[PDB]
Write a protein that binds this ligand. Structure first.
Ligand SMILES: OCc1cnn2c(NCc3cccnc3)cc(-c3ccccc3)nc12
Length: 290
């Protein structure tokens, strides 16, 4: 740590406080995360090699005095902040499309290496002035696990959690990240969280009320899942036309696929990249006020 000078606190992560810091030597500006089981060390260490333009680079891992610091590339804003700042007019569709496309590329990369994020949310999506957006905390969930509360005791959001996780599936797949990103895509479009659940049951029921209570028809095997209850209310599915106005048909088509109940049927990142929605994708520059 003596190698870094903390400049300011840039946020509180699930695992610890994140600081903007300067390397006392190179002068390099980085994000320092203060998070140990040997299993966590190996897993995290492997993350140093999982490199992609849309994945926040893990520069170094520092384990000292039984403390763990992760040195990451620094980005100037997060998507949650950016969305709040664009509330009045919303993020232009071409930029939303570009962000989705890049995030899917980042997911496609990680998933091809059999690495899941597991906790995608606007706060871990970071953007720069060049129109890039990157995934932060990839792999940390498997390395340290996802808690119900953060180190500061703040509640870990459930809004983006896939239904299979809520239903007790122990071995969920890369499909859970596609679900989360679909929820995020909807939120960028409407300027409102799609399923802002405040408990595991509220999150589940919010999903059911919009997409319909899942059954064996749409999701073979669902009634068997650990936390499934035959007593769940049976709600009918709403039209995506009401859910994400005024997203065009291509966007709604893609969203609908990213939110398929059956994780096996849910579109993969790679297939999503080929969706017609991205036929006219461009890379606009956002207006950032740093
Ligand atoms: O992945 C490392 C990371 C790299 N940049 N970064 C940023 N940067 C944007 C920013 C924000 C505030 C001031 N200057 C810059 C925020 C968070 C974060 C962490 C936890 C919660 C929210 C944001 N994590 C990171």
């Amino acid at each position: 740590m003596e190698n870094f000078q903390k400049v300011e606190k840039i946020g509180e992560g699930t695992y610890g406080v994140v600081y903007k810091a300067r390397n006392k030597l190179t002068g390099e500006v980085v994000a320092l995360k203060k998070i140990v089981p040997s299993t966590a060390i190996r897993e995290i260490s492997l993350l140093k090699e999982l490199n992609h333009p849309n994945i926040v680079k893990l520069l170094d891992v520092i384990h000292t005095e039984n403390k763990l610091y992760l040195v990451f590339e620094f980005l100037h804003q997060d998507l949650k902040k950016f969305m709040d700042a664009s509330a009045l007019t919303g993020i232009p569709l071409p930029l939303i499309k570009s962000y989705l496309f890049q995030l899917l590329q980042g997911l496609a990369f990680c998933h091809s290496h059999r690495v899941l994020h597991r906790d995608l949310k606007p706060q871990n999506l970071l953007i720069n002035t060049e129109g890039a957006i990157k995934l932060a905390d990839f792999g940390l969930a498997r390395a340290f696990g996802v808690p119900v509360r953060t180190y500061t005791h703040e509640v870990v959001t459930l809004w983006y959690r896939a239904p299979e996780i809520l239903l007790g599936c122990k071995y969920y797949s890369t499909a859970v990240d596609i679900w989360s990103l679909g929820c995020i895509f909807a939120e960028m479009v409407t300027r409102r969280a799609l399923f802002p659940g405040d408990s595991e049951i509220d999150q589940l029921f919010r999903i059911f009320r919009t997409l319909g209570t899942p059954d064996e028809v749409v999701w073979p095997g669902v009634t068997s899942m650990p936390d499934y209850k035959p007593s769940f209310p049976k709600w009918a599915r709403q039209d995506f036309s009401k859910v994400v106005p005024p997203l065009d048909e291509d966007g709604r088509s893609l969203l609908s696929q990213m939110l398929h109940y059956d994780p096996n049927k849910r579109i993969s990142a790679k297939a999503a990249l080929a969706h017609p929605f991205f036929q006219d994708v461009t890379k606009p520059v956002p207006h950032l006020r740093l």
